[PDB]
Amino acid sequence: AYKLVLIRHGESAWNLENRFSGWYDADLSPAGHEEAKRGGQALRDAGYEFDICFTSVQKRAIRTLWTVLDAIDQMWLPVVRTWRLNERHYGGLTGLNKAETAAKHGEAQVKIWRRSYDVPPPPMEPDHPFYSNISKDRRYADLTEDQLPSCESLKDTIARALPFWNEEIVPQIKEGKRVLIAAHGNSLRGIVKHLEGLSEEAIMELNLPTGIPIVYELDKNLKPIKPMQFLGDEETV
Amino acid sequence: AYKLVLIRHGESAWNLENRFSGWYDADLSPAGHEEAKRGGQALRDAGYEFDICFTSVQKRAIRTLWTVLDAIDQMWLPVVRTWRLNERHYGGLTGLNKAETAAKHGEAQVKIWRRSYDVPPPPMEPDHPFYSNISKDRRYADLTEDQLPSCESLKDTIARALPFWNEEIVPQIKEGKRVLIAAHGNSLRGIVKHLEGLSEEAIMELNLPTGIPIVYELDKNLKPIKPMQFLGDEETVRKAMEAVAAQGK
Numbered sequence: 001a002y003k004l005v006l007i008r009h010g011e012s013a014w015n016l017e018n019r020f021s022g023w024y025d026a027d028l029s030p031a032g033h034e035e036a037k038r039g040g041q042a043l044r045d046a047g048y049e050f051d052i053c054f055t056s057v058q059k060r061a062i063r064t065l066w067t068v069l070d071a072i073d074q075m076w077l078p079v080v081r082t083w084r085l086n087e088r089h090y091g092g093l094t095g096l097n098k099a100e101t102a103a104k105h106g107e108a109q110v111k112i113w114r115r116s117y118d119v120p121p122p123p124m125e126p127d128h129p130f131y132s133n134i135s136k137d138r139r140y141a142d143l144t145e146d147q148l149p150s151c152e153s154l155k156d157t158i159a160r161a162l163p164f165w166n167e168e169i170v171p172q173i174k175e176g177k178r179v180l181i182a183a184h185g186n187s188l189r190g191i192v193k194h195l196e197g198l199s200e201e202a203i204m205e206l207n208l209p210t211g212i213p214i215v216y217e218l219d220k221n222l223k224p225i226k227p228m229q230f231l232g233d234e235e236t237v
Numbered sequence: 238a239y240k241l242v243l244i245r246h247g248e249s250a251w252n253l254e255n256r257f258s259g260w261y262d263a264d265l266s267p268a269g270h271e272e273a274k275r276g277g278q279a280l281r282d283a284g285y286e287f288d289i290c291f292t293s294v295q296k297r298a299i300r301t302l303w304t305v306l307d308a309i310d311q312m313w314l315p316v317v318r319t320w321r322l323n324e325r326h327y328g329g330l331t332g333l334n335k336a337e338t339a340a341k342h343g344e345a346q347v348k349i350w351r352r353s354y355d356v357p358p359p360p361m362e363p364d365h366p367f368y369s370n371i372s373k374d375r376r377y378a379d380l381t382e383d384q385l386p387s388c389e390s391l392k393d394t395i396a397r398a399l400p401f402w403n404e405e406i407v408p409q410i411k412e413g414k415r416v417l418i419a420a421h422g423n424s425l426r427g428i429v430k431h432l433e434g435l436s437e438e439a440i441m442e443l444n445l446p447t448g449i450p451i452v453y454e455l456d457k458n459l460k461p462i463k464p465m466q467f468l469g470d471e472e473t474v475r476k477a478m479e480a481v482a483a484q485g486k
């Protein structure tokens with residue numbers, strides 16, 4: 001069985017402020033860095049070896065990957081970065097905390113966005129405080145005008161993440177390369193939804209743990225042979 | 238027409254033991270990490286931007302690159318690693334200090350090796366304590382038997398670094414991508430000798446500072462407009478270049 005490992009990054013600087021990050025490039029907090037260290041040590045203790053790594057273009061995921069590669073002494077591995085593994089774009093909610101979001105948009109709309117698979121948050125418009133910071137960041141300069149989001153539902157995030165899974169990661173797995181993916185909750189949710197054939201309701205009920213190596217065993221058709229498993233001592237899990 | 242930046246990593250844990258590292262994967266010391274941070278901050282303060290980065294498969298260079306990318310807020314850049322940018326392979330000298338090398342191999346051979354462009358150190362044989370650690374590391378599993386060195390003169394190092402420059406780096410430069418290369422003294426010497434047309438004698442004497450960004454302005458044919466220039470406070474650079482010139486002497 002092919003072996004695939006996923007890791008979701010840990011706590012970020014804006015988690016501490018209860019602020020929606022999305023495509024804002026928030027760094028890990030010291031605690032999120034420590035989580036990545038512990039996940040890397042769990043991989044080292046289990047003897048895991050990789051051949052290629054994939055991550056987003058967001059530093060909280062990239063730094064998680066760097067920390068893991070340092071812990072497992074595989075800093076020399078090829079690394080591929082792609083915006084398609086980015087966190088969901090939270091649109092006009094970017095940079096707001098919970099209270100500001102409730103005050104600006106109302107409890108009704110908040111519950112809609114919270115529980116909906118396919119209703120996006122408001123768009124990030126040119127007067128938004130983070131519009132230039134994100135939409136004019138040169139790391140997205142090669143995206144076409146229809147690819148750069150102003151906002152994303154979970155459905156949207158999964159829709160632009162899965163082409164990268166299908167067209168780049170799958171061929172690598174099929175040639176026997178041992179893949180590590182360090183990314184974000186919602187983009188990894190896309191991968192999990194696809195691997196396991198989950199419903200919209202099922203994937204919205206799925207919260208992946210942070211900082212914990214998530215291990216899949218895949219058959220010749222890249223179908224999981226059993227549920228995802230977690231690495232680390234039992235209490236940390 | 239084009240701008241190119243090189244950075245040589247700083248002190249490693251084995252430098253503090255006065256031991257030959259070569260392809261041994263020694264990590265940075267605190268001082269080596271600090272030099273990377275200062276080079277990154279120099280690039281940040283001058284507003285430098287890159288589009289692609291090249292480094293070796295050795296962590297002292299990779300960690301220097303990581304520290305620079307952190308400092309300049311460009312951790313999202315594509316990074317390409319290659320053994321062809323590795324440090325010179327010191328063969329059987331790997332792991333030895335200067336006294337042990339002199340005792341084992343003689344002052345006569347030491348003098349030859351240190352002054353010579355094309356006489357390699359002794360081969361690292363299977364009984365060498367670091368043979369399995371280096372020659373059987375899976376990161377080199379895809380190298381042909383002819384590509385995997387047992388030892389390298391400076392000429393050998395340059396001969397395997399320049400194919401990567403010509404095949405992988407030059408096309409990125411010609412596309413207009415702003416390239417950063419974070420590597421090692423001897424592989425960077427290959428790039429410098431090629432760009433500036435220096436003699437063997439001059440490239441073996443050339444002072445290559447650690448942790449100081451090295452900047453080239455190149456014309457459309459990739460010829461330097463001026464020789465390498467150094468980024469950073471003038472007095473810090475001046476003192477650093479006096480230091481390396483003194484170490485050469």
Ligand SMILES: *S(=O)(=O)c1cccc(S(=O)(=O)Nc2cc(C3=CCCC3)ccc2C(=O)O)c1
Pocket residue numbers: 020022087088098099101102110113114121185186
């Ligand atoms: S996202 O990165 O997965 C995310 C980040 C923070 C919170 C959530 S959520 O609570 O699961 N969903 C959500 C909540 C809210 C508000 C709650 C209290 C005031 C605003 C707004 C939007 C969302 C959402 O679109 O997911 C998810």
Ligand SMILES: *S(=O)(=O)c1cccc(S(=O)(=O)Nc2cc(C3=CCCC3)ccc2C(=O)O)c1
Pocket residue numbers: 325330335336338339347350351352358422423
């Ligand atoms: S290498 O990393 O560039 C290097 C490191 C230390 C010293 C040199 S060298 O003096 O220029 N050349 C050299 C010296 C020696 C010894 C000196 C005293 C005892 C052994 C051995 C080999 C070399 C060499 O291969 O160039 C270079």
Ligand SMILES: [Cl-]
Pocket residue numbers: 079316
């Ligand atoms: Cl990297």
